Amino acid sequence: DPLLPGFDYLTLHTSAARLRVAVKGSGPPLLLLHGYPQTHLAWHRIAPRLAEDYSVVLADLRGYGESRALDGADYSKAALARDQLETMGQLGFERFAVIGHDRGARVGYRLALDHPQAVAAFVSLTVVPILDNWAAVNKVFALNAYHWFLLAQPYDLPERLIGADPEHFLDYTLRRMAQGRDIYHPQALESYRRAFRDPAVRHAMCEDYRAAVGVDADADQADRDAGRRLQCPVQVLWEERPYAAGQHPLEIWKTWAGQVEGAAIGASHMLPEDAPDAVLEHLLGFLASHREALR
């Protein structure tokens, strides 16, 4: 079966970037933002169903997939959030919903915090804000999430290590993230592979991880200091696994937003590809219940 039947592939030119987007549908707009180490194809099992009722926009994040900075460039969440405002603006949308997974949910919440008039609703798949992740670091988190600390090392240490046999590191990572499950469509896999083989993409990924340690975390701290919260309805869909005290995703989001719901999904971290029907059921229910927000 076809990946993204009827999606129109575009390149958009912004002030700081050349961005790959794919679009389909009619009605209220939804922007869907993939994570690491993937691309917009990560949404292939979800986006077509959504395009039956909504305007659907899929982007590659700056530096990932086929999207690229024009330059020394800024790969901070704030900067990639600006990319999203400009992308949706050009396509004709000043206000829209945002559904993110992994790094894209990080671009998502930054965008909703910086530009609350632009974000109608926000869905996070598997993510809480980086400020909360950093406070929870301990031995087992650093082991499970070792790459968060390797990829943030100064330029060019991690680029040299991951750049040696790129496809091997890519595949290993993907298998680990999926808990060994056969969820990667063979054609989407070659797309994830060719991006990771591009040294520019690997560099942009490292820059993302550096920004997570630094400027992104500073931004989140300044918001918590100001008591600034997301102003729209929020849904969080999380991986079913134990959460320590204070680390439950629903409880964490409730400290960032006045209007929060969510649900556990019995699949791996890679929710879009591993549990698309479960996710879709919750997404569709959430967007329906908040159709007034989308107006």
Catalytic center residues: 102, 269
Nearer to its own copies, 142 or 222 (CB): 142
Q: Does 197 bind its own copies (CB under 8 A)?
A: no
> Min. distance of Cβ 127 from its own copies in angstroms?
17
Q: Does 284 bind its own copies (CB under 8 A)?
A: no
Question: Which one among 73, 161, 263, 284 touches its own copies, defined by CB under 8 A?
Answer: 161
Stretch that binds its own copies, among 46-54, 61-69, 152-160, 192-200 (CB under 8 A): 152-160
> Min. distance of Cβ 135 from its own copies in angstroms?
8
Question: Which one among 160, 181, 197, 228 touches its own copies, defined by CB under 8 A?
Answer: 160
CA distances from 213 to 103, 111, 150, 156 (A): 13, 18, 11, 16
Stretch that binds its own copies, among 19-27, 60-68, 155-163, 220-228 (CB under 8 A): 155-163
Q: What Rg value do the Cα atoms of the chain yield, rounded?
A: 18
Q: Does 138 bind its own copies (CB under 8 A)?
A: yes
Q: Does 178 bind its own copies (CB under 8 A)?
A: no
- Contact string (CB under 8 A) for its own copies, positions 212-231, x = contact: -x------------------
> Min. distance of Cβ 176 from its own copies in angstroms?
9
Question: Which one among 89, 149, 171, 255 touches its own copies, defined by CB under 8 A?
Answer: 149
Contact positions vs its own copies (CB under 8 A): 134, 137-139, 142-143, 146, 148-150, 152-153, 157, 160-162, 164-165, 168-169, 172, 213
